Amino acid sequence: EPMTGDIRLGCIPTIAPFLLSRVVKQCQQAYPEMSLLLKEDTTERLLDALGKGELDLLILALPVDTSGYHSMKVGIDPFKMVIHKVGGIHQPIDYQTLPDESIFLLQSEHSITGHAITACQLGDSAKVNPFAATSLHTLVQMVNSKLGTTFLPQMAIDAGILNDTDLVVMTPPGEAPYRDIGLVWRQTTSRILTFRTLGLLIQKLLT
Amino acid sequence: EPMTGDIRLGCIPTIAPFLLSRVVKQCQQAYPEMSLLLKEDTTERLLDALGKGELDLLILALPVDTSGYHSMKVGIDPFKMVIHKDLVGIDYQTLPDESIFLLQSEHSITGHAITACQLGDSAKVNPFAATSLHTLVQMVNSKLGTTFLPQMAIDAGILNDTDLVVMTPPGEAPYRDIGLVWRQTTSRILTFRTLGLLIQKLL
């Protein structure tokens, strides 16, 4: 029964595009009798889906509200800020130097907006472009068009989201500028061995 | 004032990462006094925002429900089926079950690819229910199935640093139309036609 059967897995669109294929291919090779029924959605709808019984496991970015659930941290990944290679000004980043609507952020339903704001210490909301984005690939294209800057997760950079771009990587304002990756499941699960195995595989996948 | 002032423009996630940056770049170079207040969202939510006044202009497809609005077609982009480089060889029902990767019905590209490629067998669809074509590209590059892709994604380099090859899907009209949608009672007729010509030249 462990590592066998149908498991309905949820993963947020800031994690799934550059982790999920390696998660699924390894489980196909090592556990071919386990069928992962995936779903890509944002955090609140994913936790709700776990509440209704729609899903059994969620791959989330950890600092969210997981009340009534069990949550296991499986890794960290830092934040970076990207600019076209031609406006590199100063490495210790002052947010007040930047022009007015020049920091692109996803719609606030994506947890990466709040995580990047709190972790990289963005205090001036006037610095935030009024783009209501949903894809970080769109923002990478916007920054590559010299239209501003954005925060990128490290796991996006390591999978070549900056390929075919003139973007460069900077270190954001410090004081723990990272994001926790974690696994979420119901407290009444009967598949704790499977979820701990998936967590160990994901943690090892987060190099 | 044509190309001056605030314009609230919405774009679907299956078009935006391949055209929106170039649209905004050319607009702020040729018309620097027009501010594009942008939004990425799916077709029904963009239509709801257009009807309630939250947005003024939408970049969508043509074959969606645009009752009570004005649609202008600005071009086409073909549908192409992409597969891993090792896995190759009119594309009939040879494919196994749960193999075609499709986005949720929330995104119009699913219905567009289904109707334009004559996909009548749902059993060949993998039950992913995705939202991002880049995730599906990563899944196909891991030898996990097929997916449909718009030509504008391939032109923007979505197959770069992958091992995917392009195949012609079995459709009589294997393409998707692109269009601009706005309220019929608008006064910015010249601005919207200008942006439509701009997008049409870009496509």
Numbering used by the authors:
A (entry chain A): 91 to 175, 178 to 299
B (entry chain C): 91 to 179, 185 to 298
Anything the authors wrote about it?
OxyR, one of the major ROS-sensing and -responding systems identified 35 years ago in enteric bacteria Escherichia coli and Salmonella enterica serovar Typhimurium (S. Typhi), is an LysR-type transcriptional regulator (LTTR) that is characterized by having an N-terminal DNA-binding domain (DBD) and a C-terminal regulatory domain (RD). As best illustrated in E. coli, OxyR (EcOxyR) becomes activated when a disulfide bond is formed between two conserved cysteine residues located in the RD as a result of oxidization by H2O2 (6–7). Most OxyRs belong to the dual-control (type II) group, acting as not only an activator of peroxide‐scavenging enzymes under oxidative stress conditions but also a repressor of the same target genes under nonstress conditions. In this study, we attempted to unravel mechanisms for functional irreplaceability by carrying out comparative analyses of type I EcOxyR and type II OxyR of Shewanella oneidensis, a representative of a large group of Gram-negative facultative Gammaproteobacteria renowned for their respiratory versatility and the potential application in biogeochemical circulation of minerals and bioelectricity.
The crystal structure of RDC203S of SoOxyR was solved to a resolution of 2.4 Å by molecular replacement. The RDC203S of SoOxyR polypeptide chain, which contains residues 91 to 304 of the full-length protein, was traced unambiguously except for the last four residues at the C terminus and a six-residue loop from amino acids (aa) 179 to aa184 that were structurally disordered. Each RDC203S molecule is made of six α-helices and eight β-strands that fold into two domains, RD-I (residues 91 to 164 and 274 to 304) and RD-II (residues 165 to 273). As expected for a reduced form, the disulfide residue pair C203S and C212 in SoOxyR RD are found at the opposite ends of the helix α7, with the −OH and the −SH side chain measured to be 13 Å apart from each other. There are six SoOxyR RDC203S molecules in each crystallographic asymmetric unit. Through interface-I, RDC203S monomers assemble into dimers with an average buried surface area of 1,268 Å2. The second-largest interface (i.e., interface II), which buried a surface area of 561 Å2 on average, further assembles RDC203S dimers into tetramers or dimers of dimers. Interface II is mediated by α10 located at the very C-terminal end of the protein. α10 from two neighboring subunits pack against each other in an antiparallel manner, forming an interface that is largely hydrophobic in nature.
